[PDB]
Amino acid sequence: SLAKSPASTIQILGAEKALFRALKTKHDTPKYGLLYHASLVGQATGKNKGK
Amino acid sequence: NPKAFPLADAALTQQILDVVQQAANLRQLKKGANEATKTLNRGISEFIIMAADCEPIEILLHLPLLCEDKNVPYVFVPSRVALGRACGVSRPVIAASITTNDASAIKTQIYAVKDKIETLL
Amino acid sequence: TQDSNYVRTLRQIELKKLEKGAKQLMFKSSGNHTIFVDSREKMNEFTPEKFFNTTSEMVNRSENRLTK
Amino acid sequence: YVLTETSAGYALLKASDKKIYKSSSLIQDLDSSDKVLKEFKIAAFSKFNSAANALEEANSIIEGKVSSQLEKLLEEIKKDKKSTLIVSETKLANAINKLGLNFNVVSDAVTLDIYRAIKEYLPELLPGMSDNDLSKMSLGLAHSIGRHKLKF
Amino acid sequence: RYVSSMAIDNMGQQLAVGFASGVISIVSLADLQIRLLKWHIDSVLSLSFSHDGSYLLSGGWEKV
Amino acid sequence: VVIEPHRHAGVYIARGKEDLLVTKNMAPGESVYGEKRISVKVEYRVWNPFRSKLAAGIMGGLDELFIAPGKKVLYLGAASGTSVSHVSDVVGPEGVVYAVEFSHRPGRELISMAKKRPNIIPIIEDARHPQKYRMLIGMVDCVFADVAQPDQARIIALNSHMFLKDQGGVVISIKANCIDSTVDAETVFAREVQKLREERIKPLEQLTLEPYERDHCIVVGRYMR
Amino acid sequence: IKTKKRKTLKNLRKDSVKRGKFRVQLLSTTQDSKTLPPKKESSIIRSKDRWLNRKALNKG
Amino acid sequence: FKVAHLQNSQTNSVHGIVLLQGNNGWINILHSTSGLWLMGCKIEGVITDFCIDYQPISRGKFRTILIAVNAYGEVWEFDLNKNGHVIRRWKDQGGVGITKIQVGGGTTTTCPALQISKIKQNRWLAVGSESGFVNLYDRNNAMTSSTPTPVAALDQLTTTISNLQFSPDGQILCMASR
Amino acid sequence: EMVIEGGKDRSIEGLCWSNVNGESLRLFSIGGSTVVTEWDLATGLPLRNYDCNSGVIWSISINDSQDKLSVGCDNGTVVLIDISGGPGVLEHDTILMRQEARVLTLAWKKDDFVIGGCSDGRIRIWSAQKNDENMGRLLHTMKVDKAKKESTLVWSVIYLPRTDQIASGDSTGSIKFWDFQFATLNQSFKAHDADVLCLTTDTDNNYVFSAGVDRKIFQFSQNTNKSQKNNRWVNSSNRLLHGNDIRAICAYQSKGADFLVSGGVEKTLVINSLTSFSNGNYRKMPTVEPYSKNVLVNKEQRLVVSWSESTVKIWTMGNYKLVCKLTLKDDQNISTCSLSPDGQVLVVGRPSTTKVFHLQPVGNKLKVTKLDNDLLLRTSTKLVKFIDNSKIVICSCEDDVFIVDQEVELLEVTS
């Protein structure tokens, strides 16, 4: 069930309440979710950790 | 690759990639596997084209598993390079979903190709 | 793109409400029921309560007929 | 004057007939059994009845899903060698152990009827077992062979 | 069975016999197998081959 | 809130706020696939005529459905527990379902629900070779067919000539497109009931289950001999 | 009797009448099903001979 | 049409052929002085373009090969110094709308040989497509594989390839789009 | 030798033989329906009606080595039927990769490939080679030169094993020869003026004969050493022998027999020589040679009975006057018939049943009444020949000789 989900979902997978409040009012969605605590995103710094 | 069920022959793959080219000109396709699965989730895909050419084919063969839940037709063509040429980008494209429309100019061509697809299921 | 996201999530809310609302209804069947019989008199007769068993209440709607 | 090879797991059963071999492989229409006709025609001759051991169960399962020349069938060829008697095999693709050495085998178009009879009344007279025990050993063998073929 | 024309090609492999009935017949000289060409509705008066031998000019009583 | 029974015990109609069809439980406490659970002290799983195929035949009205709470049944085409769960519910803990399939991709969840219910025993071999599971079980009381292969009549004829006792039931679900498209359902279903009464299957009824499936039928028959 | 003889012939020969929501079909006989192959599909036989007698080849 | 040279192969007599691309898959080859239809070569699909390759055999004998491409990307090579019979059938790797094939590095129809001993075998073969992709095959090794891979696929100009020509030495290819 | 009749609204479109060496001849045939019908040659009945599991069959062909059977159906399917199980038992094997248009003709290369001409003007090539990776999928597609103002149908396809070609006749009249490897045309002839319904070849493939609705038989030859070393058929000859059409053509060639046999819409058969087609002679058979009669007379009342398909008719001499007829439509197929001397009772009889009718001349008409006998209604009859005014002798289709109105001992023959 995780494998048949698109990669954008796997990006935002932890941040559902921020995601759906930022969709149900027209705001900017999160970019990290549960995947923020990966070591590579730890190595990145700035807006390129969103990248 | 053995585990790429229905694979098209040359004539069917030529008309599949022809309707892919005119859907790309009409901005009616979503190119890429994640965009194809998004259209599968939202139920706005007419049929899915995949490429039996990716070196892990298991990055593909999961959208069959939710094609057979929404009974949307899906087909394999032998070349990801040629699918990317048909979709009209500079990269190889692994999967492509032709999206739904009811005022579309190429609706008859889409319907003819999807009937030829669901004959071989 | 963000008001398209707003309309798309509203559409997905109604899509899920639609599918799991229609999952918990029951629709009246409409199927051509056919019964196979012997030589000609079984076809000429009325199929005499072979599965209706009342010709008033439990004959003409088939979601649950009964055997008293 | 004949035997018939019937399986339920690793437990194989070479059950002999209460009539002649020609009578077994010629008519087959006289059983029509409720219980007594199959009980009279049946004769539990040999029961190479193994246990719930997964090795023996899956070994005979692979030999049942393939040709049936297993060691239990060699045991049946040992325990039925009297005068090169007649045998009733279940599957026609087990031709090797059907006719390998001194056994006139026959499995065609009435052997299925007598297997319908003896498979209808396996548990009532052939073992000293009960219906829930036969279903439990069948589902143990089934889950074993399923997790063997379908990997995990 | 009257023959009013004949022609050979530059190899001697085939030969055109044009008959007075109107037909032409290419015989293959190595094995004497024939092929009939029927267009002329009157007598065949002239035949020729091309240099490679793959075209046959014919002319007769029609002015064609 | 009021549960009434059906023509076949183990099948009920939960009337009330939603007059909808339902079966019992043999799974204590839990659903298997997110079907709705109704308690009336006693647990009940909603059947769906769209998610499953036998429920559509029940909703269209099958009088002598030979799937019945005192039998054992052979299911040739489930691929997953979404129908054989309800068949194990209606057959109860007295009997046994043999859910036999070939494609081992949803056989994982087939075996997974067969872990939870001892009623359900799986077979992971193709149903045109019943001899490969000769040595597993025989003499069923009703076969069910849900195979969408072209040789439906031959596959269930072989399975009923090897494993179905006399005067038992045959229920076959026929998809028209898997046999012949472009010709209508009436001709292809007449052709298949004649093809099945070529064997020793006296046809009893067919119905077309039209609000639930496009161009399907369910044919019941009794196995003669 | 001249204007309805084919009517009473077909209405006595044909089967599978309606009964309300239902339809009571006759099953056929092993006699006919084992003495003869089934009838031709007149659709495809008419398609083939209508093709071979199309107007574009001037028959006469 | 394209104009090319052909040898009789029983005499050492050459003559020009014109080659016409027709409707179904047809290439109609006919004499350039008498206009007689010599032979025809049919490929399976939508014929889109074709080119002429030559290869020398001995002193004063060469062989003419017609190279014709489907729209889909599959290429036929016909030996036509004999009867117009296929000797090789391969497939372009990638490429779905194929507009123009060309050879180069030897004598093409646009770098023609003035003297029969100056006929050369072409080294390069470029198959240019509707997306602007030009596959480039090196025929010093890509006459054997039957699914040959290109030495490079150029992608620099993004719309339909309508000209691609090789310089006579065979060191420049010229992609061009109308 | 024998005749196997079918009944009302039955036709037969293709039929193929099968003789595995050491086993009996087997005869399969398609009609206009969804089944294949295999006949046992003894009784003259179908011993098997295998319903093929996809659509209405348009063509049938038999594998080389004759263990498999292709049926090409109206919904674009090519279905393989496993034949080698013994005479009578037929299994489904594999539905090959589908398509849109109906496949109108089939051929096999060997045990390996299967070629099929379809009604969209194309010629597909499938691989029926079991235990390959590409088993069942269609390897190639070829397209013939379409007609300008109507659709094109490829009607006849054969494989030519001496070369490696496929010959194909389509509905423009053109006949094309295709190299099998490279799947592509070698040469096209514009031979006929209308469709080419059937074409065949000899043993060593030096000739290809072809025929269709424009009623000429064309011969394409490759017999010259230069033709064989250049792979160049020539349009050798052309004969006009048939009256209306040619719907079937076949060839036999042995040490003391080399003839091609052809027949069409006009009901007669035509025999020509294979290697001497244009030169040699030909024989147009009579349209009927009544080895099984349909007419007999009785000298009393000067009357004559005659039965066509499922109706009998009786007239008397005088001029002549049609006195009675029996269009029995409870019947479906007819066979042989006999009248009593004195002209009292007629008995009609087919291989499924027989029926006996009392007759009474009421003047310028007759009165005919069934007289019931369920032994006659259950028995299969070939011949009935009237020992007495009451006693008849009955030859059954399963080799029984009864005497009714009971059993002749009949010795056995060395097999």
Side-chain angles (χ1 to χ4, degrees), chain I residues 295 301-306 312-317 320-324:
Chain I
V295 174
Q301 302 102 41
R302 286 163 56 169
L303 85 172
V304 46
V305 299
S306 69
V312 316
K313 285 177 173 179
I314 315 101
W315 38 88
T316 46
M317 320 315 283
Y320 74 109
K321 181 59 194 58
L322 198 149
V323 300
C324 172

mmCIF file of all heavy atoms in Angstrom, chain I residues 295 301-306 312-317 320-324:
data_model
loop_
_atom_site.group_PDB
_atom_site.id
_atom_site.type_symbol
_atom_site.label_atom_id
_atom_site.label_comp_id
_atom_site.label_asym_id
_atom_site.label_seq_id
_atom_site.Cartn_x
_atom_site.Cartn_y
_atom_site.Cartn_z
ATOM 1 N N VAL I 295 -35.167 -41.128 -56.051
ATOM 2 C CA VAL I 295 -36.369 -41.339 -56.851
ATOM 3 C C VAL I 295 -36.601 -42.837 -56.950
ATOM 4 O O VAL I 295 -35.673 -43.580 -57.282
ATOM 5 C CB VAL I 295 -36.224 -40.742 -58.270
ATOM 6 C CG1 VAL I 295 -37.402 -41.099 -59.132
ATOM 7 C CG2 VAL I 295 -36.079 -39.240 -58.245
ATOM 8 N N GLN I 301 -50.498 -48.152 -59.981
ATOM 9 C CA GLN I 301 -50.910 -46.745 -59.987
ATOM 10 C C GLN I 301 -50.022 -45.828 -60.832
ATOM 11 O O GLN I 301 -50.292 -44.623 -60.900
ATOM 12 C CB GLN I 301 -51.008 -46.193 -58.558
ATOM 13 C CG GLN I 301 -51.966 -46.952 -57.672
ATOM 14 C CD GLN I 301 -51.252 -47.891 -56.730
ATOM 15 O OE1 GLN I 301 -50.216 -47.548 -56.164
ATOM 16 N NE2 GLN I 301 -51.799 -49.087 -56.557
ATOM 17 N N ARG I 302 -49.012 -46.398 -61.506
ATOM 18 C CA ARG I 302 -48.042 -45.700 -62.355
ATOM 19 C C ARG I 302 -47.419 -44.502 -61.644
ATOM 20 O O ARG I 302 -47.360 -43.394 -62.184
ATOM 21 C CB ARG I 302 -48.687 -45.273 -63.676
ATOM 22 C CG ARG I 302 -48.921 -46.411 -64.646
ATOM 23 C CD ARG I 302 -49.898 -46.023 -65.731
ATOM 24 N NE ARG I 302 -49.475 -44.828 -66.449
ATOM 25 C CZ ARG I 302 -50.032 -44.400 -67.576
ATOM 26 N NH1 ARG I 302 -51.034 -45.071 -68.122
ATOM 27 N NH2 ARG I 302 -49.579 -43.305 -68.165
ATOM 28 N N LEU I 303 -46.971 -44.712 -60.406
ATOM 29 C CA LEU I 303 -46.635 -43.554 -59.593
ATOM 30 C C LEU I 303 -45.158 -43.574 -59.241
ATOM 31 O O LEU I 303 -44.495 -44.605 -59.310
ATOM 32 C CB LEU I 303 -47.490 -43.468 -58.317
ATOM 33 C CG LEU I 303 -47.166 -44.183 -57.007
ATOM 34 C CD1 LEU I 303 -48.105 -43.705 -55.923
ATOM 35 C CD2 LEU I 303 -47.292 -45.645 -57.144
ATOM 36 N N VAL I 304 -44.643 -42.399 -58.900
ATOM 37 C CA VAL I 304 -43.227 -42.209 -58.620
ATOM 38 C C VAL I 304 -43.083 -41.265 -57.435
ATOM 39 O O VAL I 304 -43.739 -40.216 -57.378
ATOM 40 C CB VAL I 304 -42.469 -41.711 -59.871
ATOM 41 C CG1 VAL I 304 -43.204 -40.618 -60.552
ATOM 42 C CG2 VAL I 304 -41.096 -41.213 -59.507
ATOM 43 N N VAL I 305 -42.267 -41.680 -56.457
ATOM 44 C CA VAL I 305 -41.929 -40.879 -55.292
ATOM 45 C C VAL I 305 -40.507 -40.365 -55.469
ATOM 46 O O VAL I 305 -39.666 -41.014 -56.112
ATOM 47 C CB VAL I 305 -42.076 -41.694 -53.991
ATOM 48 C CG1 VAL I 305 -43.487 -42.145 -53.829
ATOM 49 C CG2 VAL I 305 -41.174 -42.901 -53.969
ATOM 50 N N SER I 306 -40.251 -39.181 -54.925
ATOM 51 C CA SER I 306 -38.946 -38.547 -55.029
ATOM 52 C C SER I 306 -38.770 -37.624 -53.838
ATOM 53 O O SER I 306 -39.658 -36.824 -53.540
ATOM 54 C CB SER I 306 -38.818 -37.753 -56.322
ATOM 55 O OG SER I 306 -39.661 -36.620 -56.295
ATOM 56 N N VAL I 312 -40.914 -35.181 -49.400
ATOM 57 C CA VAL I 312 -41.120 -36.162 -50.454
ATOM 58 C C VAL I 312 -42.278 -35.688 -51.317
ATOM 59 O O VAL I 312 -43.121 -34.895 -50.897
ATOM 60 C CB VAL I 312 -41.367 -37.592 -49.925
ATOM 61 C CG1 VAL I 312 -40.405 -37.922 -48.812
ATOM 62 C CG2 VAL I 312 -42.784 -37.784 -49.478
ATOM 63 N N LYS I 313 -42.285 -36.149 -52.560
ATOM 64 C CA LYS I 313 -43.317 -35.784 -53.512
ATOM 65 C C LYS I 313 -43.668 -37.008 -54.338
ATOM 66 O O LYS I 313 -42.810 -37.847 -54.620
ATOM 67 C CB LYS I 313 -42.864 -34.668 -54.442
ATOM 68 C CG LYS I 313 -42.818 -33.289 -53.851
ATOM 69 C CD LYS I 313 -42.271 -32.335 -54.884
ATOM 70 C CE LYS I 313 -42.340 -30.906 -54.424
ATOM 71 N NZ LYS I 313 -41.783 -29.999 -55.455
ATOM 72 N N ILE I 314 -44.940 -37.108 -54.727
ATOM 73 C CA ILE I 314 -45.453 -38.267 -55.445
ATOM 74 C C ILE I 314 -46.269 -37.770 -56.625
ATOM 75 O O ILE I 314 -47.182 -36.957 -56.451
ATOM 76 C CB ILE I 314 -46.349 -39.166 -54.572
ATOM 77 C CG1 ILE I 314 -45.768 -39.433 -53.181
ATOM 78 C CG2 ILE I 314 -46.536 -40.474 -55.258
ATOM 79 C CD1 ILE I 314 -46.361 -38.620 -52.076
ATOM 80 N N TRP I 315 -45.977 -38.277 -57.818
ATOM 81 C CA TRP I 315 -46.874 -38.008 -58.934
ATOM 82 C C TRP I 315 -47.116 -39.267 -59.747
ATOM 83 O O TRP I 315 -46.355 -40.232 -59.693
ATOM 84 C CB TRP I 315 -46.388 -36.872 -59.851
ATOM 85 C CG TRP I 315 -44.968 -36.787 -60.108
ATOM 86 C CD1 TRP I 315 -44.280 -37.417 -61.082
ATOM 87 C CD2 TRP I 315 -44.039 -35.959 -59.422
ATOM 88 N NE1 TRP I 315 -42.954 -37.075 -61.021
ATOM 89 C CE2 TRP I 315 -42.786 -36.169 -60.008
ATOM 90 C CE3 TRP I 315 -44.142 -35.069 -58.358
ATOM 91 C CZ2 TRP I 315 -41.645 -35.529 -59.560
ATOM 92 C CZ3 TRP I 315 -43.008 -34.427 -57.928
ATOM 93 C CH2 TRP I 315 -41.776 -34.661 -58.523
ATOM 94 N N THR I 316 -48.211 -39.235 -60.497
ATOM 95 C CA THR I 316 -48.659 -40.356 -61.305
ATOM 96 C C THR I 316 -48.543 -40.016 -62.781
ATOM 97 O O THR I 316 -48.630 -38.851 -63.175
ATOM 98 C CB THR I 316 -50.114 -40.706 -61.009
ATOM 99 O OG1 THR I 316 -50.885 -39.501 -60.975
ATOM 100 C CG2 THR I 316 -50.234 -41.416 -59.680
ATOM 101 N N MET I 317 -48.361 -41.051 -63.589
ATOM 102 C CA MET I 317 -48.483 -40.910 -65.028
ATOM 103 C C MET I 317 -49.949 -41.046 -65.434
ATOM 104 O O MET I 317 -50.796 -41.498 -64.662
ATOM 105 C CB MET I 317 -47.618 -41.945 -65.741
ATOM 106 C CG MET I 317 -46.266 -42.159 -65.090
ATOM 107 S SD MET I 317 -45.464 -40.606 -64.653
ATOM 108 C CE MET I 317 -44.860 -40.064 -66.248
ATOM 109 N N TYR I 320 -49.184 -36.330 -66.502
ATOM 110 C CA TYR I 320 -48.703 -36.600 -65.157
ATOM 111 C C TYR I 320 -49.419 -35.659 -64.205
ATOM 112 O O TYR I 320 -49.848 -34.572 -64.594
ATOM 113 C CB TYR I 320 -47.186 -36.412 -65.043
ATOM 114 C CG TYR I 320 -46.750 -34.961 -65.036
ATOM 115 C CD1 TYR I 320 -46.256 -34.369 -63.881
ATOM 116 C CD2 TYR I 320 -46.831 -34.183 -66.187
ATOM 117 C CE1 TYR I 320 -45.863 -33.046 -63.874
ATOM 118 C CE2 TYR I 320 -46.441 -32.864 -66.190
ATOM 119 C CZ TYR I 320 -45.957 -32.302 -65.033
ATOM 120 O OH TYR I 320 -45.568 -30.987 -65.042
ATOM 121 N N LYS I 321 -49.535 -36.087 -62.955
ATOM 122 C CA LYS I 321 -50.272 -35.308 -61.971
ATOM 123 C C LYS I 321 -49.684 -35.535 -60.590
ATOM 124 O O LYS I 321 -49.564 -36.681 -60.154
ATOM 125 C CB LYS I 321 -51.755 -35.680 -61.979
ATOM 126 C CG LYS I 321 -52.587 -34.882 -60.998
ATOM 127 C CD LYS I 321 -52.491 -33.401 -61.293
ATOM 128 C CE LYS I 321 -53.026 -32.579 -60.139
ATOM 129 N NZ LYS I 321 -52.286 -32.877 -58.883
ATOM 130 N N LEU I 322 -49.341 -34.441 -59.910
ATOM 131 C CA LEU I 322 -48.787 -34.512 -58.562
ATOM 132 C C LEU I 322 -49.906 -34.839 -57.590
ATOM 133 O O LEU I 322 -50.769 -34.000 -57.320
ATOM 134 C CB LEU I 322 -48.095 -33.200 -58.204
ATOM 135 C CG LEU I 322 -47.105 -33.183 -57.033
ATOM 136 C CD1 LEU I 322 -46.036 -32.148 -57.320
ATOM 137 C CD2 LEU I 322 -47.754 -32.886 -55.690
ATOM 138 N N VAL I 323 -49.891 -36.053 -57.057
ATOM 139 C CA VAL I 323 -51.025 -36.514 -56.274
ATOM 140 C C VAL I 323 -50.885 -36.205 -54.785
ATOM 141 O O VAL I 323 -51.895 -35.979 -54.113
ATOM 142 C CB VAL I 323 -51.252 -38.014 -56.530
ATOM 143 C CG1 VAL I 323 -51.538 -38.238 -57.990
ATOM 144 C CG2 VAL I 323 -50.025 -38.830 -56.146
ATOM 145 N N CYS I 324 -49.663 -36.148 -54.261
ATOM 146 C CA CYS I 324 -49.443 -35.924 -52.840
ATOM 147 C C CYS I 324 -47.996 -35.516 -52.626
ATOM 148 O O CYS I 324 -47.139 -35.705 -53.490
ATOM 149 C CB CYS I 324 -49.762 -37.167 -52.007
ATOM 150 S SG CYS I 324 -49.297 -37.028 -50.270
#
